[PDB]
Amino acid sequence: SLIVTTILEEPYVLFKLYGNDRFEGYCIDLLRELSTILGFTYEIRLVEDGKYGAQDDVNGQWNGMVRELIDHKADLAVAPLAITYVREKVIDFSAPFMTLGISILYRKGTPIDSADDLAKQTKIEYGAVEDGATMTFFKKSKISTYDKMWAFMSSRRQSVLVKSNEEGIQRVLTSDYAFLMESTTIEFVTQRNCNLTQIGGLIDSKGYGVGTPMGSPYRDKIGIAILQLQEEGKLHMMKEKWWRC
Amino acid sequence: RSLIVTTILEEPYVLFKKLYGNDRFEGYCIDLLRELSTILGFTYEIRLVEDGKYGAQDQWNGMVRELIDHKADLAVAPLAITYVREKVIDFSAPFMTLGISILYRKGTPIDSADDLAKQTKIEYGAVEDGATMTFFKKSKISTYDKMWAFMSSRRQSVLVKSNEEGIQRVLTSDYAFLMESTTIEFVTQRNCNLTQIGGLIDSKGYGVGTPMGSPYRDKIGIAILQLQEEGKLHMMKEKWWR
Numbered sequence: 001s002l003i004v005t006t007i008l009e010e011p012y013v014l015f016k017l018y019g020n021d022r023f024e025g026y027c028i029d030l031l032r033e034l035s036t037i038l039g040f041t042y043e044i045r046l047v048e049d050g051k052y053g054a055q056d057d058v059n060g061q062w063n064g065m066v067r068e069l070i071d072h073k074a075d076l077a078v079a080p081l082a083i084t085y086v087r088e089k090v091i092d093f094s095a096p097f098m099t100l101g102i103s104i105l106y107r108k109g110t111p112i113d114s115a116d117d118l119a120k121q122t123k124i125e126y127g128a129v130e131d132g133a134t135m136t137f138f139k140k141s142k143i144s145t146y147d148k149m150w151a152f153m154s155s156r157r158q159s160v161l162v163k164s165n166e167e168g169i170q171r172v173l174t175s176d177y178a179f180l181m182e183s184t185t186i187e188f189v190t191q192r193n194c195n196l197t198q199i200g201g202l203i204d205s206k207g208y209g210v211g212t213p214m215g216s217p218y219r220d221k222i223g224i225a226i227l228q229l230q231e232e233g234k235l236h237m238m239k240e241k242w243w244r245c
Numbered sequence: 246r247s248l249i250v251t252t253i254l255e256e257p258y259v260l261f262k263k264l265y266g267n268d269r270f271e272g273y274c275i276d277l278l279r280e281l282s283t284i285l286g287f288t289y290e291i292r293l294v295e296d297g298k299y300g301a302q303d304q305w306n307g308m309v310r311e312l313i314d315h316k317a318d319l320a321v322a323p324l325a326i327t328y329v330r331e332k333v334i335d336f337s338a339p340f341m342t343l344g345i346s347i348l349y350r351k352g353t354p355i356d357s358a359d360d361l362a363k364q365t366k367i368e369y370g371a372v373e374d375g376a377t378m379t380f381f382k383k384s385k386i387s388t389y390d391k392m393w394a395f396m397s398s399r400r401q402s403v404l405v406k407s408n409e410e411g412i413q414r415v416l417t418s419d420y421a422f423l424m425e426s427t428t429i430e431f432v433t434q435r436n437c438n439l440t441q442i443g444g445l446i447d448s449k450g451y452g453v454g455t456p457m458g459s460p461y462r463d464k465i466g467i468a469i470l471q472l473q474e475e476g477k478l479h480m481m482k483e484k485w486w487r
């Protein structure tokens with residue numbers, strides 16, 4: 001039986017009881033499909049510290065699901081966990097089951113048109129989920145524009161970084177603020193808020209993948225089952241199902 | 246030890262420079278190989294796959310077979326990451342994302358794959374035994390199953406040996422070519438009378454291939470992720486797609 005770590009994020013994982021019946025969502029459907037294909041059984045556990053996976057700056061310790069895998073406290077991570085260089089250095093990822101990018105969530109009708117338009121001003125504050133792949137992207141970026149956006153963010157950190165996608169969306173809906181956010185979530189959000197839009201194109205390019213501890217014999221099997229799910233159009237069906245202004 | 250890298254000629258991924266050894270070659274994949282070489286600290290010799298194939302099971306052939314038998318350490322090419330290939334070799338994280346789509350002439354009523362499947366006047370096909378054809382052959386999706394029904398009975402007349410043969414087919418007859426969206430994009434920039442019909446029919450990536458169990462898999466994956474996040478892969482694509 002596999003211990004599966006995960007986290008609540010709509011519509012990937014949400015509360016529907018006891019055990020695995022507690023949950024539903026894209027990632028739950030995916031987990032089910034993989035289970036069927038590979039013939040394993042599993043117990044789902046929500047990550048204890050409510051984190052995704054970042055390395056702390058003072059000490060070199062990892063948190064979240066990543067840490068969970070690193071420590072072998074979980075066999076798999078199934079969540080909208082971005083596949084990043086930093087993370088890929090300490091755990092293994094399956095082939096991606098979803099492709100996305102960082103982008104801008106904002107109100108419609110403004111002249112803000114791209115990351116650059118944001119970066120060269122201070123009237124409109126902007127931000128990201130604290131210690132998520134996105135913020136980490138801006139923090140590690142050596143691209144002038146994004147480096148400057150990180151200077152701005154890090155200097156105004158206390159009031160422009162947030163603890164969740166929902167908090168950020170609320171920030172956009174209750175103040176002059178632009179939320180650097182993952183595009184799939186954006187797409188989900190703008191279906192439900194008619195005055196929210198994606199500003200500009202995709203700032204980068206990444207995938208969501210299943211996480212395994214480094215050197216896990218399940219990374220490959222899982223990657224293969226995911227590839228299969230993609231080829232037979234299952235993942236697209238799960239997308240339509242969970243995403244359907 | 247210098248690594249042996251298997252690849253294959255395909256514009257603009259790998260082409261003969263207009264020389265000896267690695268100097269003979271240029272392209273997006275050669276640039277990529279150079280970046281990987283710098284990041285991971287290795288030297289290499291580039292070799293074109295003898296049988297000139299990517300990799301299909303009849304026994305495997307092409308670059309996949311080269312990897313399986315340890316005749317090469319890496320495959321760097323526009324090699325689609327697929328279920329069937331992944332069961333026998335290891336792919337790095339993808340350096341490019343794409344999908345099967347349709348290359349056809351402009352100005353027709355054809356707007357989708359289903360538009361092709363439901364008629365017979367316009368013929369259509371794909372590279373034989375490549376990832377695209379294999380996609381259709383194995384598909385349970387009604388439209389794609391029908392297109393495959395069409396194609397398998399006409400294997401000799403609608404299937405081609407290369408993207409190039411397919412493009413000339415599109416240009417010289419009433420024919421639609423099922424092809425990879427990145428190559429379609431490369432092509433529609435040089436023949437303004439050609440176009441993509443519809444959107445992407447599936448989703449896949451190209452990855453660097455390594456023999457199953459190779460310790461280079463992870464390091465290469467990490468380098469590709471690094472290249473992606475600093476914008477280098479995108480710059481390489483802009484460079485070669487214009």
Ligand SMILES: C=C(C)[C@H]1CN[C@H](C(=O)O)[C@H]1CC(=O)O
Nearest residue numbers: 052080081082129132133134182
């Ligand atoms: C839901 C948030 C906290 C997570 C989900 N994916 C990103 C991650 O893998 O860290 C984070 C969002 C982001 O940073 O844009």
Ligand SMILES: C=C(C)[C@H]1CN[C@H](C(=O)O)[C@H]1CC(=O)O
Nearest residue numbers: 299323324325372375376377425
């Ligand atoms: C150049 C062609 C023969 C290759 C390239 N990628 C696909 C592959 O990985 O097999 C093939 C094309 C295709 O199948 O549409």
Ligand code: NA
Nearest residue numbers: 088089091092
């Ligand atoms: Na890893």
Ligand code: NA
Nearest residue numbers: 331332334335
């Ligand atoms: Na594999």
